Every structure is written in C-alpha cells, then in structure tokens.
Subunit: 344 residues, 2 copies
Amino acid sequence: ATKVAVAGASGYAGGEILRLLLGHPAYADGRLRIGALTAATSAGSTLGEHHPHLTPLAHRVVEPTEAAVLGGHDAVFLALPHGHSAVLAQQLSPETLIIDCGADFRLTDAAVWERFYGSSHAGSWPYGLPELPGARDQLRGTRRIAVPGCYPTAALLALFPALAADLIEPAVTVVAVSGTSGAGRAATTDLLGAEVIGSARAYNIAGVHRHTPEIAQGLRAVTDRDVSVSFTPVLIPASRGILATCTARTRSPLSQLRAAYEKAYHAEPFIYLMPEGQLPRTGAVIGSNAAHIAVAVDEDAQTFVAIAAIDNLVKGTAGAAVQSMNLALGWPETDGLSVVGVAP
Amino acid sequence: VANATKVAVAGASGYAGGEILRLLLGHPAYADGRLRIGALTAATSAGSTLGEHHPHLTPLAHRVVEPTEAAVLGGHDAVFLALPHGHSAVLAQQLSPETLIIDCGADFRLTDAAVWERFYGSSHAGSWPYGLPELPGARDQLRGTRRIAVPGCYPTAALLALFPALAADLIEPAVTVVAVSGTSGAGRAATTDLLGAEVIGSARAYNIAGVHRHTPEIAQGLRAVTDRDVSVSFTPVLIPASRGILATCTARTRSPLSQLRAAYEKAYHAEPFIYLMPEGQLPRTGAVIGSNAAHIAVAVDEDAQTFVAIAAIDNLVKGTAGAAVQSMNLALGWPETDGLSVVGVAP
C-alpha cells in the first residue's frame, strides 16, 4: 500500500502529478493512495479552489507544508520547481521515496550551483530522465529523484544521441518556445493573459537562465569534449508545450545522424522519431508523456538541426516524476503515462 | 516631390493586400486627397465586394474586386503587387515602365540568378531596390525609385537584429536564426495545416534545415555589409498568434558587449522605426503589433562566446505592408514616416 504526499499541491506541477496519480493503474486497484496535499499559503482551502479539473479530489483540504505532515508516506513529491526543498528533504526517512521537481538536487557541481542559484549546494540525486545513457539504472529501486527542468528535458533528448556518437560539435545552440504554465502560477503582470495572449518574448537570455548549466551538464555526461550551450527560452501564447530547436555544427551525413537516433530511441516507449518528412508539433504531445523528435542537416550551413516537442507539464515535469516513480518502485515504467496527445 | 498619386492594389483580398489598404486609408495623403485608392484586384473571387474579404476596412467595403489584369491595373501612378511568385515578373512587363511598382512578392528580391533558380525553379526576373530603408545604402536606392522589392518578413527581423554587429565586424559571419511567427505570415490560402483548431495551442518548426525561401534573402542582406562569406541556419516556428515575428539571432563573438551596443546605437539611434531596448529590457511582439516598428535587444553570452540579438516586428507591418508604404513614401518624396505609427496596439 503506497501512500503518496504531494507538497506544493496547488501549483501547476503538483496538480499535474495529481492528474496522473488519479489515472494510474495502481490508484485504480488500490496499490496507490493519495495522502497529504500541502501548500505554503491558503492552508484550509479545498483542492477544488486551486484545481477545478481534479474533481475526484475537490473536497481534499490543503494542509500547510511541514516535514511532519509529509512524514508518514511512502513517496513524497515536492513540486516546488521554482521552490527550494533541500530543508524538507533532509528531515525524511532515507527509505521514503522522495521525488523532487525542484532544482535543489539536479546539479553535480557545487561551484556551478552557487553561481546560478546563490545558495549552498545541497548535493545531487539520480536525475529523473530515464532515457539518458545510464540514467535508468540509477533510478531502479532508488529512494531519491531529482526531476529534470522542462527545457533540459527537451534539449537533452534532441541533442544527446548526436553528441554521444561524436557526430556534431560540442557547442550547441538551443532556442525553445514554451507555453506559459512553465513560468508557474505566480500572479505577475508579465504573465497575465491580456499581456501574454497574442504576444511572444524571449526572456533570461544570453546565459542567465538557470537551465543553461543543466543542459551543459547532461551533454557533458555523454562526451569528453568541452561543451558550450547557448540557450534562449521564448514564451508564446499557449498554456502548455515546449518546442525546442537545437543546432550544432556537423560534418556528418544525415544517414549517419539518423541511425544514431534510431539506435538510441528504437526501444524507448516515450520517444517518437518523426517519419521521413514529418516534423514535431507541441499540439500532438499535449497531455502525453511523449517526446516527438525530428533531425535534419542544413548542408549549406554545415548545421545539424534537431527539433523536439514535449508537454512541459508531462514529459517536462510531472510525467517524468511519475515515470521515475514507477522505476523507483519496481512498477512498469509506462504505468499511468500515455503516449497519445490530446489534440486538437 | 510627387504632388499626387492614384494607387492600385493587386492581391487586395490577401493579408498583405488588406494591410496595405488599412495603411493607405490612414495615410495623411489619403486624408488631404493627394492619394486616391483606385483599382483593387485579386485573380480569385473577382466580382465580390472588398467587405467580403476584409470586414475591418469598412470605408472600402463596397468596392468591387476586379480581375488582376494589366488593363485593370494601368492608368495608376503606383501599383502594389501582393501576389504569388512569378506573377509580378509578368505583370511588370505589361504595366507602363514609368509606374511606381511596389512588389510585395519575391520576384525582384534576389540579386543572384543561380540562387533564385535554385530556390524557386524559374528564370530570375531581375532585382529591384530592396524595400528595407534601414539597411546601409538602401535609402539612397529608394529615394525617387520607380521599383521596389519589399523584403520577406523574416529577413526583415533577422537583418535588423544582425547587420550592425556584422557590419562592424564584431561577430563571426556564421549566424543562427530561430524566429517564431504568427500564422498570418503563412498567407491566407486555406489549408488544413493553418486551420484555427490545428494552430491554436500548438507550435511547430517548418521548412527547416535551409529549405525556407527566406534563407537566401537573409544571407544576401548579410553579405551586403561584410566582405566575409556568410552562412545562415534559419529555423522558422509557427505560433498561435495571428501577427508578430520574434527573431532570436546568434553568432559567435569575442567582442565586449559595450562595443556591440555602441554599434547598434550608431546604427539605430536616429532611426524612427528602430527602438534599441534599454539595457535589461527585452522585446515582445505584443508591443509592436499594428505599428511599423522593430524592437531590438542585444546581449553577449560570455560562457558560450555567443552574441544574441532579439528582434520583434509586426510581420504584416514592418515585415510587409509597412515596409511597402515606407518605401512608397521614399519613392514619392513624401516624409518617410507618413501613415506609419511607431506605436503598437497593445494589449
């Protein structure tokens, strides 16, 4: 009987965790129960007031986030993706499965962590991207998961098989368009619908976005070369989805790059390589745990192009958390996680 | 100079054609009767009224759209052509040589015939003055011209983001451009791909890896400001907005930011339609929508040794019909900014 707490239940990531927990087969047959739901403000409200889609849970009372209230469960999701849960996490049984959606345990280099986050490095846990080389073995039976950023997920899946095969140069460029749920649920003026609808803007450009060092890290794990990453995020008028356009210099033929992708992904249940002459679109993956990837070579520009679409809130966040949870617990990896998008 | 213009618009039922008409209606020469809007043509739906295609242009809603034929178009001092490629090549032969022809199509844009044939599969028609007044030397070609090749919308954004850095030799001549575009940039021909239900809530790269026809136009405009060999990786991305291009443009650099900034200030400090963002501010297409302005920011990613330039335009105004009307003013000797706001209609 696995009992699950969700900390930060009232944000978009915690609500998506909850959606996926409700359709999971272990919730259906009673192997999984949903326990405490916690947030920082508005303890006492019901979940219905934060998440009106989650009607089976609408009556649950949101409790304050405290170590003791998260205590007494077998898995704890901490869905502060812009939060800092290192504190909570040090006060829980090393036998409690902790799946942190935040960044606290993502980065392996303390100098990098301090620089980008301006605090003390908490350490690093198994990175919840099972498709990266060697990641899936770290995750089997683990009691600790650092879920990847949404953008690192899309860019890593677009780029790592080319770079691992040494078929492109290790200086990469990523420009990724994203829906606004990826910015979180904070009432800012720059996130108001009247401001975002009809409009597009890059933000946190030229190296300041904290996902830059995350992408570098993931690629440095598949190569001995010095990796450099130009990362530009662009907010677009959609609620969900990331479309990552990833490029690097190459002198390799298209047919060799294509084989490196078939090889890496042929048995990956969540990776779909586009058929010949098709390109990814984020509307096809919305609400699914899938990544749709197409690769190409720009001969005149000597440039390799990889395009990856994901739902930022599923494969980029809560579907990755749940996928890695399946692994940590010995359950089928694809349990509760569809590859079919809700389109149009 | 010009004390009067009778103007025809061919391809009047398309997006660019309807935006030319909007700008002409609000143009001061239209208000004081120096500009008369004459024949409105479209090969398609000839016989309908303009109101059936463009309900926003109520002052012209009763005008009957005529067939696009040189005889309907003759008798005008200025003719806008917003037509598929190849059409203006034919039309330019048939109209008086003394007519001002402002071509929104691609026919006269490219200066290399081999590059044209490669991307279009037809005979090169020639090349006319490129209607981007802000590029070095362009304003001198457009003053008093009778021929204008209006730029494509994406090269407009990518050219304005990148030329100053490259002209000053502060970036490498190998550039990457990822530009997100509203769907009006894909035209007004009804296909499944461009349906509301498919576009809304979705983003997709298309015509990637160098196959997009705007790619050689970016390379051409960049090659005109440097003696180096230029390469362009251009990726266009359709997004769920109807208007706006946000171009993210990068090239390797070893130049300090202060030197890059200075080159942009030098380029744009007295350009009425270019707003170089104050340091720490970034462009948004919502701020330029409905105006003839480009908002630009630049920065350096030191760890990646990469120059980053962001440009925002309205694809239908500075990227198309605004560019056309701005170049028309130059061609006619009227104030360059007539009819053209720098003020976006936001939110």
